[PDB]
Amino acid sequence: GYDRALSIFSPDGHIFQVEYALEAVKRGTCAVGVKGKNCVVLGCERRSTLKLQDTRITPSKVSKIDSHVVLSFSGLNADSRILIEKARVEAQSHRLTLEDPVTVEYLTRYVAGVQQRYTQSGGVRPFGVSTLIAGFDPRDDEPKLYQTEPSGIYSSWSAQTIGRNSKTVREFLEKNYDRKEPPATVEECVKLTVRSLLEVVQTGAKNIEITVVKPDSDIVALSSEEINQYVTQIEQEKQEQ
Amino acid sequence: GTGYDLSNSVFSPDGRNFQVEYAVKAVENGTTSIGIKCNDGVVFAVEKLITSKLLVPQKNVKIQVVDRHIGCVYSGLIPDGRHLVNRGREEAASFKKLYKTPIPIPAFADRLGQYVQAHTLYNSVRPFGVSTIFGGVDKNGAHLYMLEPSGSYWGYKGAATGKGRQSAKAELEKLVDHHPEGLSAREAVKQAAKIIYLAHEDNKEKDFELEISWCSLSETNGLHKFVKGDLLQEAIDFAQKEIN
Amino acid sequence: MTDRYSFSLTTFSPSGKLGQIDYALTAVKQGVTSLGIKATNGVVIATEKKSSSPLAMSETLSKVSLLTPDIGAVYSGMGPDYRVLVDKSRKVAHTSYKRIYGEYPPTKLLVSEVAKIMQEATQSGGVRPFGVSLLIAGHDEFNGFSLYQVDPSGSYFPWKATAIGKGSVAAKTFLEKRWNDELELEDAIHIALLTLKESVEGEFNGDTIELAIIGDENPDLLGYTGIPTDKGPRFRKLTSQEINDRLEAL
Amino acid sequence: GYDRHITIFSPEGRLYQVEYAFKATNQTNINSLAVRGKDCTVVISQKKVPDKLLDPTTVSYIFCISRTIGMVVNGPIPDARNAALRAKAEAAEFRYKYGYDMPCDVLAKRMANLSQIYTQRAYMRPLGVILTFVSVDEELGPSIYKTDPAGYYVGYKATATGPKQQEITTNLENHFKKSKIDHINEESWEKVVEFAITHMIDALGTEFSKNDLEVGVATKDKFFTLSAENIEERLVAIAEQ
Amino acid sequence: RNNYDGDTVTFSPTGRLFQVEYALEAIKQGSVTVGLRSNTHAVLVALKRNADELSSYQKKIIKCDEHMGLSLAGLAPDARVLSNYLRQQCNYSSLVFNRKLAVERAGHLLCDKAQKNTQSYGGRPYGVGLLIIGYDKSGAHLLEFQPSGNVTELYGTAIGARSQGAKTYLERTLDTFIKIDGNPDELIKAGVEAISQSLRDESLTVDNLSIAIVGKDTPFTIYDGEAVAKYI
Amino acid sequence: QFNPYGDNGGTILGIAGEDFAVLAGDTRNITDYSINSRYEPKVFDCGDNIVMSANGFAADGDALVKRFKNSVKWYHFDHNDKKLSINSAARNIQHLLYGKRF
Amino acid sequence: DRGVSTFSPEGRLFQVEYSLEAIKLGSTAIGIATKEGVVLGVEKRATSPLLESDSIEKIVEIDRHIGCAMSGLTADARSMIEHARTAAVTHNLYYDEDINVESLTQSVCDLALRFGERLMSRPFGVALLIAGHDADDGYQLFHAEPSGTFYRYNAKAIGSGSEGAQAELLNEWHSSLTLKEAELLVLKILKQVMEEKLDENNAQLSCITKQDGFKIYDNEKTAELIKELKEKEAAE
Amino acid sequence: MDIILGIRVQDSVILASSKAVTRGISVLKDSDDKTRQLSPHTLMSFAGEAGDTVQFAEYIQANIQLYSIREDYELSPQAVSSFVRQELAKSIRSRRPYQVNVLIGGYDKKKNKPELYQIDYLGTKVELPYGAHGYSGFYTFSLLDHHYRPDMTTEEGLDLLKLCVQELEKRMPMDFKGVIVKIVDKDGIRQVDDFQ
Amino acid sequence: WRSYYA
Amino acid sequence: GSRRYDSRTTIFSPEGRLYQVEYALESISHAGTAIGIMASDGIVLAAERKVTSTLLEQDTSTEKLYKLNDKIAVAVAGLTADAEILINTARIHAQNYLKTYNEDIPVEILVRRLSDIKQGYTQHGGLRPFGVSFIYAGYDDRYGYQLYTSNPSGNYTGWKAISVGANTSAAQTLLQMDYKDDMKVDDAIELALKTLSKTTDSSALTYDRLEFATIRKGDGEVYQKIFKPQEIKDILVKTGIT
Ligand SMILES: [Cl-]
Ligand SMILES: [Cl-]
Ligand SMILES: [Cl-]
Ligand SMILES: [Mg+2]
């Protein structure tokens, strides 16, 4: 039984192992989510330092938890699997014992609880991961979007981004998202998402992935052709005096 | 040691276990306590420093009994002593439960020792902060024993440990010359009071209260009893006389 | 009063070195030379019984050890470690093979098992690696003769011949010279005594040399007769006399 | 570095804690030697009682392990009695489980194997003692087997242990070089005890009183220890030759 | 000291166990409390401490049975633990043996419970001091518990910050109050004076004064607030 | 076979008035056809103005009362000497009993 | 790196005392006791404007008669709440009665010290205002710290503003205060110590009364209360 | 003795399952769907001891659904029936074994073949063109042996099934309150809502 | 100062 | 007590990197290079032995290429004994999956479980990571030929061609140039052999310093071939390196 306390307080009241876990997130690819009026979109970046990777089979950064809920993340990939599994299992347990799928908040509160437990249990280190969890409550049309962090804290967001250069992307979103009039179309919500990744990706559209989640378990990821189609026009409306 | 004295089970480069030696310092700093073996039993005596006139006299007993025939006294960290005695009490019951006969004194000695030595084996425990004087009458005699934090123990004619150990040992070696053909249970009680008084002159700053117990095949029927009442005063007196 | 050492005592250093394995190997290097040679119809393993007092009785101590009736082991490094590894190896050869298949394990698999025992001392909580290298030599029906080396890391490799311990780099070169794929067992026994002769500076005779072979089946060592498919053991330790007889003819 | 404190390797490939454990075996300043007779085995050891307050009869480093195995300990008494109990235990269990008396060499292997362990598991220290086991074995004849804190053990024509090990050893080496045999060719154990006490004196350069020694004998039937009087008888005889 | 005080399983080169000593320092920071006894009763007087003008006053006295109780000075959480264990022993003795737990035996049981946390790796000593009073078959009793494990029987004492004031007073008035038999109101007054000798820029009020009494035919009961008006 | 249950007889009665309540039982304790005692009280005062009786197998009956009484003692220790409402006791005894459901 | 249960040379447990520092950085929270009920308020303090400030829950119900406000590492509070709610429901299952406010506080504090190497690895990084009503000691407000200790306060403020905000309460609090007086007074003190202009979106009110139990005020109600307070002030 | 019938025609698999739930003396319900959908193309019916029956089924359900989300892929029917047999084969030597029998009917969207599997509480599994559990086989197997053709249409199967259900209504002492019928084909799982 | 002591 | 000697093996650096994972990767960088290249019709695994002597027997020697399963194989780079531990658990997992579902384990599921195990040694239990990196070459009737890599962190990803061990930044750059999606198996074979000869820290590339294996379409099934010493010498002449 190895139970040494790895997350402890230091004299100024910090918990360095949790804070250093946040540093793991900062080093991770950028992830972003945007709420529409009738949908939610999650976008992630693909590191472009690796040109020879099979994209058929490399695990995507957006994961289905249940047929109505998705989770993306920035941070250590391997850590992400543990959270994603725990969450997929819990959703199925919820369906069993309540005869109802999880609310987007509930599944989030669950993931965050696991993340928190790893910050005050002997023998374990915090998760180097932050998540964006999105979807629609069952039999409900109001889109939902939440964020969790290694500390266990979670909250909801009209739009939000995490990972390397999220300060930039958040500025962009903060100066492009009208709470009072949120993107009224799927097509233009995905537009606002690609745009914000282009502040920090540049490069190609095979280094972006987009996923559209719509009410009543309607989840689809776009293809390079679909995504590049948004790269152009975005880069064209640019060049315009 | 040069790093070699921060954990317990660690050998220094000349073969020592400093953590045990540091425990001995705790024993040496303790109250003085003795045992005198006689021709048919053992006497135990101990010094009770009266820290303050607020301590109730007669009322902080220090000598502990094990089973019905074994007496124990210790110097140093008192709660450590109580701990060991408890283990001894368990160990004597286990032995009697299986073998029926109450535990022979040498058998008891090694039960304690094995346990104390056990506490020098791992850096997750510290040595016992006590030296213990114990003995009794068994199927073939009286036996006195003293047991050190290292776990070492041997059988003694008389033994002492604590702050006044040196005065005590000196007076006990004398006691073995004059009264060498043998020392009777009753004289050993008297001589015990003498030795505690003489030993108390270190710690002369504070007053003290004498406490004696014995276990004599003829005077207690082989059972451990506390010397109280008249026989005690007779010894307190014999001490006052013989120090001048 | 319980094993409160739940954590690895062997970790990666910033350079990528697994320190305690490195040091364990060092301990092997200090150990007496031991060597093995594979021939077409036998394998031989030899080492020096350098006694630690003329009052010690060298026969009471074997560096060469029978693992199965067809497999032998010799070592270089910390003897007491080798000893408890021979116990572990003999037991595993039963619990994890004989009790399941009714056969003794074949050489590679037993070697594989010993490796796992050492690999684990490289990663489990609160323990140091083993401080020995092993040369295991033996024979099974489907793989023939074989010779293996197993290191404190848990790595093993199969050899035509090799040596470990003190004058190993020297002796390795000596064996590379004299070894072909046509040696008979008697030929290799010769080369072994010769290769051992340089790594040894004092007296060199059948009382200071240990040498055993995996060869023909010795039905005379079986102990019982009447089961014709039981052929008897291929491992055999040479006698003190049997060594000298070849030492004169050297 | 911490490799001086627990039983792990030094960059030299060494176990300092095993080495420092050896140094503690001499902490008693007591010498011992054992030799084999025609049909007995004798171990002799110094007996030093410096405190007038000690009961000399309770002071010994010779333990009767089984009816046939005697064990002499070179080292501090607490570790020595710890070792003795474990051997007494191992020998009673061996008899129960297997139906014969545990042989001297076998007990040595078993204790040396336990010894090895404390050099490999970090949570236990070696014992600061060297164990000399002697018997007249029913298969091997008179036997001497000795184990140390390194986990090493072997058998000896004769042996000696302690601070003046070397003087005694070179003494006995000379005698066995001249006699050319592996034992004292004497048929009485009383004579063999004398031989031992003799060559002890000639090698330490000191005479012995009947209270300076402690003597143990193993015959086919049993292993027993000699009294002060059985010793004085021995000493008298040595003086008449 | 630095090298010898990171746990309770390390001796100092001079024989001390710093972790236990640092534990005693918590007691000295606690608020003063006094115990004293005659031949017929035993009394606790305690000075309760508050945080603000707006906060309550931390309780200092705890009933353990109908015949036994203690006052605490130091880490209040730890006293809860120890007083809970003491209530359990009192209760076991009552249930299994139909026998009230002798005060001496409570002391012994307490000492041994605490001693476990000076030989235990990964544990800590208790950070609290306890004054225990009770009436059993051998009369009135007062015990002083220290986190070292040492439990001591006295006629009187006081522990906590500025405790020396009350202590010296009790050593002075000793022969007087031991004889206060069969007059509880007069023994409490004796205790209230003793604790008074330990104030510094503070006067006893109904909100900060707390008093407990037990003895022959008077079960352990606690007075706070208006109940303690009588004695100021 | 060892049968862990017995029957010590007894009859008990409890009546609730407007400002009062009574609980009564005979004081005879039996085994088979023998009398164990002609006065062994079975109706007990538990404090906080609760009287209790557990009639039938008397060892079990005593055990239950003993354990409820302890429940009261610890209720006080754990809730500032608050009186134990009869209705609250009733709930607590349900749990005491159902703990041994099997 | 010493051990988590270690005592300092001044008699304090390091990890507990470091834990108290983290609490000082937490968003502010205030509770006030009045013979008409008890008021809990919190600084929400959203980080970005995209953060939906409704999902910021620093006031939670424990039972119908017991509410709780938190300040510090708030993620550490989830399981203290879960235990508290379970103690409230369990006590009712066992005794067919509501749990006492102090008894539930005592239960929460018993978790605080269960760490070492001893299930949890470190103390909690969060403090609690626990406000409630029971029929033995009426309205009550309690302050629970990761030290395991707790005090009953007539009013108490924890977090960033605490040091100053508390001195404010010592002057403004009196026993004949009314529920509405303490509502405004909580809004007032919060507005002074927050860094943003207080509005019905970065601050939250709620109370506990015998008749209506524990409610968290909806934005509408709080806003209509913020205005009324701006006006009483301009009326100098 | 509830009725668990299954027949695999050429393009689909048909499960017919008795609707009645009788506890002792009363018939508690006449509309009980003894089915769980294990995935879009796999349907399992079940009969046996009271609580065991649904517990096992929904347990198997949740497990296949979890596998589906994790691999974003729908396990073949052969693969599901193997996981199901394994669970029961584990159960039978457990403390309280599940006392459930099941039919598993699925469309193998990869082989484009319908498949019907029969598994009893012991973990006995057989691949069959038609199957039943309990006494139901005793009246219906002679009908099915006769009129069954491997190339029957879904409508022919339904007609043959109607025949089987009518013989059960004639000769079986229990009123089982009719059946619910479900079809599994390339397009998923639909319930024939007007069956006689 | 310190009010963490009773 | 013993807390004095714990190298905390599962902690974060102030930059948010996992010390022992980084140090273990440093270790792996000194191991013989292994390469995997995926063609339209097969997969090629080639690796370099760091252990070389005249007397070393190579007919019966394995150090880098291991069969997990009839349709999956691994190339190993790192502590070869750590590899065997992880390998045998993987060989089991494939057999467990077959027992449960009566279908061969899909390549990715096996890769995930092996990587999940590594990730565990990274987050709890206080043990050291496995100093191992894997290239997985497998075929399944759902994604066809697949190529993967996992390392001590427990992260895994899929590749068209990839390298592990020594000189990977060099080798990966050579592969990025000359790899074309429409390559055939024999093209891939020689791309791999030619990448090693350009990055080897050795004199020349000789058969006695290679292991080599191909997974190709066989029969309507998939054959898995681990070249014998002689077959390697041949392919080295055929492509012209000898
Ligand atoms: Cl956990
Ligand atoms: Cl091991
Ligand atoms: Cl108050
Ligand atoms: Mg494993």
Residue numbers in the entry:
A (entry chain R): 3 to 243
B (entry chain U): 4 to 247
C (entry chain P): 1 to 250
D (entry chain O): 11 to 251
E (entry chain T): 3 to 234
F (entry chain 1): -9 to -1, 1 to 93
G (entry chain S): 9 to 125, 132 to 250
H (entry chain Y): -1, 1 to 195
What did the authors write?
The eukaryotic CP is a barrel-shaped structure composed of four stacked heptameric rings, each consisting of seven different subunits of either α- or β-type, arranged in the αββα fashion. The luminal chamber formed by these rings accommodates six active sites of three different proteolytic activities: peptidylglutamyl peptide hydrolyzing (PGPH) (β1/β1′ subunits), trypsin-like (T-L; β2/β2′ subunits), and chymotrypsin-like (ChT-L; β5/β5′ subunits) peptidases. In the latent 20S proteasome, access of polypeptides to the catalytic chamber is restricted by the N-termini of the α subunits, which form a kind of a gate. To facilitate the design of proteasome modulators we determined the structure of the y20S proteasome in a complex with Blm-pep, a peptide capable of stimulating the three proteolytic activities of human 20S.
The crystal structure of the yeast proteasome:Blm-pep complex was determined at 3 Å resolution. The electron density accounting for a part of the activator was clearly defined in two pockets, between α5 and α6 and, symmetrically, the α5′ and α6′ subunits, even prior to the introduction of the molecule into refinement. Despite relatively low resolution, this density unambiguously defines the five C-terminal amino acids (10–14) of Blm-pep. Blm-pep anchors deep into a pocket between the α5 and α6 proteasome subunits at the face of the channel gate. The C-terminus of Blm-pep is buried at the very bottom of the pocket and is stabilized by hydrogen bonds with the side chain amine of α6Lys62 and the main chain amides of α6Ser33 and α6Gly76. The main chain carbonyl of Tyr13 participates in one hydrogen bond - with α6Arg51, whereas its side chain provides multiple contacts, mainly through its hydroxyl group, which forms hydrogen bonds with the main chain nitrogen of α5Arg20, the main chain carbonyl of α5Gly19 and the side chain amide of α6Gln31. Blm-pep binds at the same α5/α6 intersubunit pocket as the C-terminal part of Blm10, however the interactions guiding the affinity of the two molecules remain considerably different. In the structure of the y20S:Blm-pep complex the enzyme is found in its closed conformation, which supports the fact that Blm-pep failed to activate y20S. The progressive increase in RMSD from the core region to the distal ends of the proteasome indicates that although Blm-pep binding does not induce gate opening it causes small changes in the architecture of the α-ring, presumably resembling the initial stages of gate opening. In fact, it may be described as an intermediate between the unliganded and Blm10-bound structure. This indicates that although binding of the HbYX motif at the α-ring may be necessary for induction of an open conformation, as demonstrated by others, single HbYX motif binding is not sufficient, and only induces an intermediate, but still closed conformation.
